[PDB]
Amino acid sequence: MLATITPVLGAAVIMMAFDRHWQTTFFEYAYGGDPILSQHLFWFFGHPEVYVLIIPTFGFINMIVPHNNTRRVASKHHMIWAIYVMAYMGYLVWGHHMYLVGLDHRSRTMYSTIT
Amino acid sequence: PGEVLPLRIIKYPLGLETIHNNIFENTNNEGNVELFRLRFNSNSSKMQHKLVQDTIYLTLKQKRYNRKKVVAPQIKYYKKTDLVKYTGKPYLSNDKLLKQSIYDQTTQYKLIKKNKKRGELIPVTLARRILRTKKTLVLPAHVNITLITNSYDIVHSWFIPGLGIKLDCVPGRSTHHTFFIDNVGFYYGQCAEICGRYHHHMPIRVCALPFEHFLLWWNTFGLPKMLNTVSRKRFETHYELRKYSW
Amino acid sequence: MWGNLWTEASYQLNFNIGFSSLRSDVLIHLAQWQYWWWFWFALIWSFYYFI
Amino acid sequence: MGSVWFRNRYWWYRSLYDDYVAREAKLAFGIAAFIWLPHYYWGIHLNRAFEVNFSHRNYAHEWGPRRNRLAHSLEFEQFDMILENWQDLEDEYAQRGDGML
Amino acid sequence: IVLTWGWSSFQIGGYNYERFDDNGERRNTLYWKLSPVEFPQSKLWNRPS
Amino acid sequence: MAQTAHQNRYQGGLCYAQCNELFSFWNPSIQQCWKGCDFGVGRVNDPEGRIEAQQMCKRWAAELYWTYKGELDTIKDLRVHADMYPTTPQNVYRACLAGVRRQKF
Amino acid sequence: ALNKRNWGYNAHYKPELERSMKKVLYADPNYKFPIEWPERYMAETKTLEQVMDEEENWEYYK
Amino acid sequence: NVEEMDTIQKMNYEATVNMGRQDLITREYTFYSDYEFIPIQEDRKQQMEDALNNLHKIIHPTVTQLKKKANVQEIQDRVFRKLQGWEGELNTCVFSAKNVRDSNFCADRFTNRINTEGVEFVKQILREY
Amino acid sequence: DLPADYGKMPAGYNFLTRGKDWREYDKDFILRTDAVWEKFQLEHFFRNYMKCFFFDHGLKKYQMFEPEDMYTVVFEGWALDDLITFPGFTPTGRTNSYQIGLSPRQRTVVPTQTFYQMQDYYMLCGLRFERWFRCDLVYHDQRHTKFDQVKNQKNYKTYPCYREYYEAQYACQDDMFDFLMELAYARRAADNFESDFASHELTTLPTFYDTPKAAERKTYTY
Amino acid sequence: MEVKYRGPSDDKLECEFLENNLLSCLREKSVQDNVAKMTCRPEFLVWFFLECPTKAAVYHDPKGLRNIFIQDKIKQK
Amino acid sequence: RLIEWQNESSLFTVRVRARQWYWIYKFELKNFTDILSTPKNIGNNRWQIN
Amino acid sequence: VCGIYVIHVIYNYMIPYYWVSTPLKNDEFTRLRMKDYIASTVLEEVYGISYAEWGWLPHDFAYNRMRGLAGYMHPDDPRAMCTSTFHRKHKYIEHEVEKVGDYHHMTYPK
Amino acid sequence: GFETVVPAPPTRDDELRMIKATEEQFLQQPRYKLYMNEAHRIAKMNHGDRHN
Amino acid sequence: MALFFMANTAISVPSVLDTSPCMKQMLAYEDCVLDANVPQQEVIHPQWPTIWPRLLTDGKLLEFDKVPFHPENIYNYTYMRPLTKKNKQYLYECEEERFVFKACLRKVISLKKTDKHTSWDTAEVANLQLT
Ligand SMILES: [Cu+2]
Ligand SMILES: [Cu+2]
Ligand SMILES: [Cu+2]
Ligand SMILES: [Mg+2]
């Protein structure tokens, strides 16, 4: 997941630096830019970052609980596929952080229903 | 750039006006409908006048409450004839009467500022510190207001917790929102998008009133402005109060 | 205050738990939905009692 | 309700998780009934309160201005009665130029 | 701790608040048929959210 | 269908179908024609009822848009086409009249 | 006939009062209203002078 | 007059006068680098306006009897293509005009084109409709 | 109903009710048992609800101020500012208490449904301002001689671009309207009509609406 | 909706103001408004019946109203 | 369904422009006329425009 | 499910957006209306009204009935053509409206 | 691009005749011909027949 | 929400019944006036012939000595407009409703709060408020 989102985050921050120090106006609406693009880029990186943070703790509990209970875990295959589909959905729910910024209702409904 | 050419032939748009099912806006003195127009350029080097700003807005600048050094009395002048026609220091009583003050209003203000009694469960109505503004946005209740939200510089958030709404004022985006308040209510608010130095102290006050009281406010504080007449009440305020009636 | 018409809507005290004001349609609907949402867990909760 | 509908119950448990919590589930059935009771009753009370509030909102929206108009008409009718009496007095004054004074 | 309190404490508190405090009404209101209703407690303080 | 009498177009019946056949799929004049169908229920088969339904269309168009007095009486053509949109009270009135015309029973 | 509704048209005053005159007037088929029901919600095109002249040069239907 | 109007009426009258007096102010600000041309004289302007009025008089019965804005716009588009070709010719010939005699020659040629070829073209078009 | 002129107003009818017996109408209305209590409640509600003005003793007259939060009324009643004189709800002293609704909509020249999917009306603002600027370029210099800016306001005629102007104002914001006004000033000074440069119709896919016989394309029906 | 309660003020200065307005209205409307200058404020009339009920009683008593009428005529004279 | 998709059906319009650390509420001139044209529910649910 | 939803978004939100990119001489308003209709009239944003008793109480339903009739009053609104009717009585109980067609105003439910 | 004579608004009999014609044309449509009720439905069906 | 998510619907609660004294008479009179279609809004009060008698003479309800009188539309200074004959005719047909309204108002005014109103405190229950 980090392999997928790191280029997007890097592009976003590089564009921010260029806008700050070169006046490239990537996010100035007066002549073409839009801050909503910056929000989209960051949150495209954003939510997958939090899903990167949270998932390994599932591994920690799924290791500790069977060890002390000296029994097999409930469904390791299903848990793996659940975390993988969560990773899949992490790339289509980045807009639930941008409900109010004025996104089109089509995109907003897509984000809400996938979230 | 280039020139305003000597002659230009311009087509009159058709069907722009459907007020009485007539598609010909223009009609010359002879009584014939005009489809074309000739525009002539007389002075080649003459500049073209800037488009005249036809937009008039009643502007209410809502800013944070400002501390008063001294409580000035109510002073009214004759007939600008700096002779004091009337001077007084009113105070609103408990029974809703603007009585004449027997105290020192500056002393009362300073005492309330320095040391006021508070409690562990004091209502927000009686304890406001980052929620006071100079002006209030008065809107009618049980009716539809379009709110075109926008920002001068950076992204802010018009956040009303009481109504449970929040509009992200984004630069460039002239974002239209529906606004319906089903109750007579005074709602406080704050900026809910990080904007910098005074992000915390960026308060909002919105008063939804029944259309009679909103109309009274409109005719006493909103319609007086946005008229572009002399500041005399006989020529402006009463003017609209007798010319535009609901 | 607008005369004796108390237009204040929040009335929230310190140590408040619920919404700031239940005077609006959106917040009334949200409060009712949250209460009845918490209503629909009994069986599940009972299950997690016996485990 | 549950595994009774299935004719290979073992498969059922297997095909769900291969884990067995049926007894806890049934104890949960009973206790859940007897614990949902009071939350539901208080929710009935809250629903009635919300309905009362909505009815009050409808009445205030529709009949508040009507009641204000009725009060305005009442005050104007009191003034009308006073004006009729005052006009009777004025007619008497016209009949008697300064006898009343 | 798990079942009995978490499913009755809020209801008992709301019932006593209505019974002993009138749901915290500001009683100086003129007409009931035109007044906003002071609701009973509807936000469970014993729940995480 | 917010201003219409039926929860869905299918409950509206044949008249509603004809309305959907009258205009293109992106036309709110379909909704105006549905309102016309509503006005024509139990009135079309009677001449006085039909005149009353046409007057109902007049009133509906006058309420929806700011209309001038007599303007709806000076419409050159009362026919409708697929790309006629309810942007004017005349268009609303024409769509409503078409809906009344397409009303059976 | 079951689904026939007025839908808010000709929603003029219906006299419930027995002594009301309009009731009897509304029973007369020749009664003419001041203005047609669809025309009540339409903006007036005539000027003030024309409207006042027409209303002064007006005769009751009876 | 001004003395017979109240304060608001005086404000409105001054507003109308000032809005009418835009061009006057712009007469003071002229650009050096612009390409000057001899403008069409007032008599030629009036003659061209009269030719346009004649065309409108010819057009009026047909378009007023037409109930389709599409047809009226089609007539307008065809006549405008013709008149725009003639207008381009006139502007080209006037911008390069060295004096008022040349400007008058160009304006008279344009007016004759309207009065001779324009009326015939418009009549044929209207006979089509 | 017995007279043939029933309902006809008698000549010289002054509508006055002086010396009229009101006992005739005793059976024409019904009053509840709590009518006195309801009357007092009505008076109290009207007094405490409508009276948003306070009688200043120094001026011996009514005054009012803009709506304020309870705190400012309570703990700063001695620091009230911007007090004005109460003029009245209506000029003639009638009632102003009416339930309101939605007024009939305005005619639309440029529909909102062109870009109704977007909550941000930037494309709609651009389109509406484009249409208005076309209209203005047609009619801008005739405004003070043939339209609303004439000196003889008795001959006032509405400027033909009023509706498109107000639609553009509604669609756009203040800053966007000012940007588009700067663009409009540049294009009006240059006298640049869009048709003077437009050549994108050649590189556009053909459509059923692009048929040469546009007028015959529409199928009108009753 | 949330309307507080406050009984009729009966403030002496406010009641004098409303009394002056009521007397002006009575004088002007008794002659069908055939006056050179109309100073009546009918809106304020309603407040006289909400803020000064005691005075209202004086105006609903025939003897009190007659005395007020005589005093006002003397003042005008 | 009650707080969205109703921009074109509104009594009137207000511009909320946020400048750094304060708000600006702009009322367009047309709103004035709209406030003059608000219908009144007079009588038994009958609507009139003056 | 996500992909079918994503395909549905791509079908009516991206490709239609790429259709019209220049001002159009002929029926520009109609073409833009089609483009916006296929995207703004999605049932997900209009279907709720058909089942409103689930969330609107009999008095709240009565109040929101006039709020919806005055909210979708504009005739020029294709999604209002897809929105379910507001001229229906509340299923459980209706207090204000007796007949759904006996009004005193065409655009008001009372 | 001349115009034609616009006929008077149809009477109830003409409305009933056109309603019957629309009913018959609707009934003629097969179940496997999936064309929604639209103004362009007949044109699209003819286009589909030619394409087939 | 869902099919049965609130688990209860308070159908027992009725619409707030109006107990105003002369509300029905006021509504009938206002309906009659709207039928009359009088541009003067002051006719909504049954006491208008005594409150604004100028409507029957010349319509001059206010003094414009200092405030300018600048009519622009027909919908301007409607109160400054005398009742035209036609209007008067359609205001004559409402005289019965107006008289009933005024009689109801007079009877309500004549009511007094005596000391025999023992249930004055507990009148909210009487005025159908305990829903
Ligand atoms: Cu996220
Ligand atoms: Cu900020
Ligand atoms: Cu901020
Ligand atoms: Mg934010």
Short mmCIF file of N, CA and C and ligand atoms in Angstrom, two decimals, chain A residues 47 50 93 96-97, ligand 1:
data_model
loop_
_atom_site.label_atom_id
_atom_site.label_comp_id
_atom_site.label_asym_id
_atom_site.label_seq_id
_atom_site.Cartn_x
_atom_site.Cartn_y
_atom_site.Cartn_z
N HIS A 47 -5.85 8.34 3.55
CA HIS A 47 -6.51 7.18 4.13
C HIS A 47 -5.70 5.89 4.02
N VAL A 50 -3.46 5.63 7.04
CA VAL A 50 -4.05 5.18 8.30
C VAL A 50 -4.34 3.68 8.25
N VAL A 93 -12.05 5.40 -0.97
CA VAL A 93 -12.72 6.10 0.11
C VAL A 93 -11.95 7.34 0.55
N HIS A 96 -14.01 10.70 1.69
CA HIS A 96 -14.84 10.93 2.86
C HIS A 96 -14.22 11.96 3.80
N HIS A 97 -12.98 12.36 3.57
CA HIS A 97 -12.37 13.49 4.25
C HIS A 97 -12.67 14.82 3.56
CU CU O 1 -10.07 7.99 5.53
#
